Amino acid sequence: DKQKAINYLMQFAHKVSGKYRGVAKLEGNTKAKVLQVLATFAYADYCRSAATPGARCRDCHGTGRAVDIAKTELWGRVVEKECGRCKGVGYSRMPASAAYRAVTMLIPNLTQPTWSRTVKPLYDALVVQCHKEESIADNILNAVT
Ligand SMILES: [Br-]
Numbered sequence: 658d659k660q661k662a663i664n665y666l667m668q669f670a671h672k673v674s675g676k677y678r679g680v681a682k683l684e685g686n687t688k689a690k691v692l693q694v695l696a697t698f699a700y701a702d703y704c705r706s707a708a709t710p711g712a713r714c715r716d717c718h719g720t721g722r723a724v725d726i727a728k729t730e731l732w733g734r735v736v737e738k739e740c741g742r743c744k745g746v747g748y749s750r751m752p753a754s755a756a757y758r759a760v761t762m763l764i765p766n767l768t769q770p771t772w773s774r775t776v777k778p779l780y781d782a783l784v785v786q787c788h789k790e791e792s793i794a795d796n797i798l799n800a801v802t
Pocket residue numbers: 661662663665666
């Protein structure tokens with residue numbers, strides 16, 4: 658069930674919600690609903706971009722990152738750098754306005770520039786979180802062992 662995936666993304670949203678002031682201070686019920694909406698639109702945004710030619714950078718597949726070979730070897734652990742191809746952008750940011758409208762149903766006083774600064778970053782963190790997940794699983798499935 659994809660609800661399981663959206664809910665898992667929602668659990669993550671709740672964990673990092675403290676970093677975003679637009680959500681960190683909401684009443685419990687409202688916060689839960691807002692995170693549910695962000696998780697639901699972010700996931701749909703991820704899915705669409707992955708199945709749509711050109712919607713994701715073809716080098717990083719949405720993460721906007723690449724492995725720094727030298728540093729990974731130096732530090733004995735995976736060290737990442739920006740993906741040059743998309744300059745770290747990874748996916749289109751246009752789908753976010755639909756999510757903004759949905760969130761305004763819950764926080765009616767929220768303006769777009771305020772959402773942009775205090776809530777949207779959480780939305781984007783959830784979208785890239787999905788790309789990163791896919792990438793890690795990819796690395797795992799195709800590891801020359
Ligand atoms: Br998920």
